[PDB]
């Protein structure tokens, strides 16, 4: 028995999938998914590991680097989350990997954006975000996936998602 997916590693839809940081020991398991593309929201530039990992395997690296702030602190900029979720609903860029450092926080704010689009009430989002976060689960980022608006996006169609 010798993958060994990422931190907090879970698919999100057809194409998608969440993470917290990998590192080496998760790469064989990474190749199982025929990634195209990762999504990576932390500011840090990526190490040579992981920059190796990623060319040798044709992957494409979007860094939309969020500022990793703790409550009471958390001011997540809509302009980053707006520019990943573009990426995200270009079915071009599928497979995709989300990442942050740990896979609840920026990570769960993308995704909870998602589930907005994809027209799930804020309670079942705030369930799927509670799940990964755990004791670290933050109000600030259920309260930006409540406010965060949508209408720019009204038109993008998402043929991909096992939700029709």
């Known amino acids: 028995l010798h993958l060994i997916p990422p931190l907090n590693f879970s698919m999100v839809d057809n194409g998608i999938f ?10 064989s398991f990474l ?3 025929g990634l195209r593309s990762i999504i990576y929201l932390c500011p840090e ?6 920059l190796q990992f990623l ?3 044709g992957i494409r690296l979007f860094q939309f680097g969020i500022e990793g702030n703790k409550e009471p602190f958390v001011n997540i ?3 980053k989350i707006r520019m ?3 990426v995200l609903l270009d079915e071009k860029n599928h497979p995709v990997l989300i990442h942050s450092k740990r896979g609840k926080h920026r990570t769960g704010c993308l995704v909870g954006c998602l589930r907005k689009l994809q ?3 804020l309670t079942s989002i705030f369930d799927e975000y ?3 976060a755990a004791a670290k689960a933050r109000v600030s980022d259920q309260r930006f996936m409540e406010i965060f608006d949508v209408s720019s996006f009204s038109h993008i169609p998402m043929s991909f998602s096992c939700s029709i």
């Not at 993470?19 to 790469?27: E, H, M, R, V, Y």
């Open 18 to 27: 969440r993470s917290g940081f990998p590192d080496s020991a998760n790469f």
């Open 31 to 33: 190749q199982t998914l």
């Open 45 to 50: 530039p990526y190490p040579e590991s992981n």
């Open 55 to 57: 060319k040798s395997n």
């Open 77 to 79: 900029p809509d302009h």
């Open 84 to 86: 990943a979720l573009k």
């Open 119 to 121: 027209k799930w009430c």
């Open 130 to 132: 509670q799940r990964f």
